[PDB]
Design a protein around this ligand. Structure first.
Ligand SMILES: CC(C)=CCC/C(C)=C/CC/C(C)=C/CSP(=O)(O)OP(=O)(O)O
Ligand SMILES: CC(C)=CCC/C(C)=C/CC/C(C)=C/CSP(=O)(O)OP(=O)(O)O
Ligand SMILES: [Mg+2]
Ligand SMILES: [Mg+2]
Ligand SMILES: [Mg+2]
Ligand SMILES: [Mg+2]
Ligand SMILES: [Mg+2]
Ligand SMILES: [Mg+2]
Lengths: 304, 307
């Protein structure tokens, strides 16, 4: 059993609002008409609960509804035709990007555009102008990464390990989720601290772990759809090796990346007591996400 | 004197655009038209000759925007560093609300000042040469530059001095170097994919190049910044933290500069192979960072600003 190797030298936590938030995410998905096929156990609110465990219910609900939105958007890209049609996806992302800027939805817009607009409207009530910009960009880059994956599928091109790993950092909107840690913990990190190279390298490390963990768990389902945007499948193509060896290599990178994150957590320079207090809350927020992603995915029927 | 020149060397060469002089004369004409020129050596500014060195392969239309942009930063910085607005957070937030609005595409009004009109002209001209995604990335780096200037204003107003770690982290934005680095894409006419543009090794090369440029400037600009009682300078910050002599601080400042050049060269060889086309485009961008490192050094020793 190779899944037992997805381990960390730290533990996670879950919000006491977990179930109340998850049932509210289902009501939210139903309201904006995101529920279509079949849908008893999605439990997208139970991932948010683990990801932002100290968050007040109102903020955790936005995060939960946001995580839900991403899963609905991802399933469309990876298991339907739009993920092989760039023209359709460009037309869709033009509407999303307009909604991110604060444009009101119109009669011709789809359910996902309406849903994103509500999340943007709600984030606007709880986040300052400077935060929305940083969120917009990370989400804008998330769309760009999906258009890139769409082109690869449409042109039948598989990227090398170097290219995939670089693109995979944006293709999961992990940086956009890490932004919500600021609102969840209610911290105002100053520009110099927020964008410091060590914080970036901690974010990059945390992002890789989360994504490479998911790649090990979701390779079977992505393989059946012929979607090779997966560390295991990209490694297999590059090294022309067996699937067990490809999994073994992916887990070696995961293990090495956990070590890097732990090593680099101690390399944060001292700015002042107040700023460093806020940073450890954010860096704790990263660790919560690392665990939240692994804890949920092993129990979730999605990778069964 | 020679001790400085031997420690401000780089293992790579710079270059200058053949359009240098007409671009500089046009920048002086542009500045005068928008009323950015103060009554006082107006021909001995040469803001165009920095741009020419910074973006040497750029077409004349593109280089001119960059030259007018560099001129704009210089006029703006002199306000924050050598006038009363840099000791008043209230007036600066009011001004910075107008700039950020102009960057979002807002038309200037009657009550707006010269710099607001000048920035609106640059955004309009950049909108004709750069796509939507580029303008966003430029706006952010310029927005963070404004925030960094507001943070210095607070430090001056309270009479507080940051430690080496705080200054070095904040100095990366106070220069608007990332905003200047964005123009390399338009200058070299390259389309770097998201994954290559925002890659960690590329980010490390940028902040390495940013540190070299800013720490080089600090070594040459501590005399005139000391006169205004401003300790936003690696030399003066190291002196404050260590409580050492001014020669010792300069030595420590040039040590960091020297090791950062060594880092940049080491990081340059660590860029992974994506594909022929992307690596070629990225090769042109990283060369652009080397041109900027030399441009800042070559110009500042040449210029009258630091004398
Ligand atoms: C899915 C998504 C964009 C957001 C919600 C899921 C979250 C927040 C999990 C963290 C790891 C990420 C971002 C991978 C999902 S993309 P994938 O195509 O690998 O997803 P899959 O393996 O099908 O679950
Ligand atoms: C004016 C400006 C922000 C940019 C022009 C110079 C450029 C583009 C080079 C990169 C390093 C910078 C910007 C430092 C000057 S800020 P400072 O207050 O230290 O300025 P000074 O040293 O007095 O020239
Ligand atoms: Mg996907
Ligand atoms: Mg998927
Ligand atoms: Mg997956
Ligand atoms: Mg300054
Ligand atoms: Mg100055
Ligand atoms: Mg200086």
């Amino acid at each position: 059993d190779y899944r037992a190797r997805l381990v960390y030298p730290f533990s996670g936590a879950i919000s006491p609002h977990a179930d109340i938030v998850d049932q509210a995410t289902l009501a939210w998905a139903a309201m904006f008409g995101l529920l279509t096929d079949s849908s008893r156990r999605l439990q997208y609110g139970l991932l948010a609960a683990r990801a932002y465990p100290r968050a007040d219910r109102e903020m955790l609900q936005i995060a939960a509804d946001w995580i839900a939105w991403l899963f609905f958007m991802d399933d469309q890209c990876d298991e339907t035709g739009i993920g092989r049609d760039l023209q359709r996806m460009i037309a869709l992302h033009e509407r999303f990007l307009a909604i991110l800027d604060g444009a009101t939805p119109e009669a011709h817009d789809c359910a996902l555009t309406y849903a994103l607009a509500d999340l943007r409207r709600r984030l606007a009530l709880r986040a300052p102008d400077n935060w929305l910009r940083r969120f917009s960009e990370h989400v804008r880059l998330y769309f760009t990464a999906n258009r890139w994956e769409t082109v690869n599928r449409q042109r039948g091109a598989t990227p090398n390990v170097a290219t995939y790993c670089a693109a995979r950092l944006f293709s999961g909107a992990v940086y956009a989720c890490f932004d919500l840690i600021e609102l969840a913990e209610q911290i105002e990190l100053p520009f110099y601290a927020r964008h410091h190279s060590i914080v970036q390298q901690l974010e990059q490390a945390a992002n890789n772990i989360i994504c490479w963990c998911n790649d090990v768990l979701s390779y079977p389902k992505e393989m059946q759809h012929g979607d090779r945007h997966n560390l295991v499948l990209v490694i297999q193509g590059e090294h022309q090796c067996s699937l067990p060896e490809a999994i073994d290599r992916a887990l070696d990178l995961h293990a090495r990346e956990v070590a890097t994150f732990v090593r680099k957590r101690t390399c944060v320079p001292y700015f002042d007591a107040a700023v460093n207090t806020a940073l450890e809350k954010y860096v704790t927020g990263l660790q919560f996400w690392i665990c939240a992603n692994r804890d949920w995915s092993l129990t979730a029927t999605r990778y069964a």
